[PDB]
């Protein structure tokens with residue numbers, strides 16, 4: 001690897017690992033369209049298994065970028081429109097609060113205060129219908145952003161309904177397979193269990209538990225190589241030969257709402273580049289934030305910091321890229337450590353290399 005990349009990565013990540021007590025970590029830097037990989041520590045402490053380029057990590061909310069792109073692909077296929085009312089794809093959702101709530105609102109967390117988590121008691125299709133029927137919005141649609149698994153997760157579930165495919169089958173056929181993400185999974189198959197890292201929470205080895213809309217909101221597991229490929233695909237969508245997938249990637253990086261310095265895409269979030277790190281971190285506190293509509297949405301802006309953070313009980317992930325500079329980073333760790341430290345490290349590395 002070029003010595004500049006080796007040096008900035010090791011000099012940034014080694015102290016991070018020490019300060020945060022991270023058991024294992026994988027990092028990829030994409031520099032002028034080429035990936036460079038780094039690994040440290042342990043995927044499984046007890047069995048002394050090291051982190052490798054084939055280790056699977058839980059992506060947590062980074063999964064939402066996949067959901068956003070899959071939704072974009074469905075738009076490009078003509079199967080859904082973001083202006084469609086939610087009720088077009090779930091006619092059983094008859095409660096009057098749903099009038100005026102569209103697929104865009106679900107995908108961008110602007111439906112009017114859908115909650116961060118689906119309750120654990122919700123299991124069956126009927127439990128989920130009941131949950132959404134009984135939810136009372138605090139705000140009118142399209143006025144405030146409140147980050148919510150129950151929002152984007154419902155978007156993902158409804159976006160695949162016209163296809164007739166399950167969410168997992170649609171994701172595999174329409175996103176993972178075309179991009180050659182052959183070690184990226186919604187459910188880890190037995191054959192790959194040897195590569196599935198354990199997460200660590202308070203010293204205990206843990207994996208994410210099943211839950212309603214888990215696949216759509218936080219369910220993807222992936223390797224550092226596949227995530228590097230995902231970043232490359234999002235940096236250079238025009239290189240993608242499947243027309244609807246190229247278009248869906250573009251749609252997911254469009255700017256639909258603004259709050260402060262941040263713009264909301266489909267799954268992805270964006271800021272204008274050059275960007276101050278403090279501003280990036282300005283968005284631990286669950287915040288209700290008024291949004292301004294971008295009417296119509298701005299197509300993907302190349303001079304952007306495009307990013308997403310993710311966590312599960314035992315894992316912490318971060319992805320960021322700058323399309324204008326052909327530069328990106330993926331950081332995967334098997335401990336959920338604070339987001340500001342992730343952003344600080346990513347910015348140190350990418351700013352050094354741009």
Ligand SMILES: O=S(=O)(Nc1ccc(F)c2cnccc12)c1cc(Cl)cc(Cl)c1O
Pocket residue numbers: 059060061062116149208217218309310311312313336
């Ligand atoms: O819901 S999440 O999508 N991930 C998770 C799912 C399931 C869990 F039990 C999690 C337990 N701890 C942390 C995250 C969990 C999510 C939420 C938030 Cl407020 C921030 C990020 Cl970064 C994120 O990924």
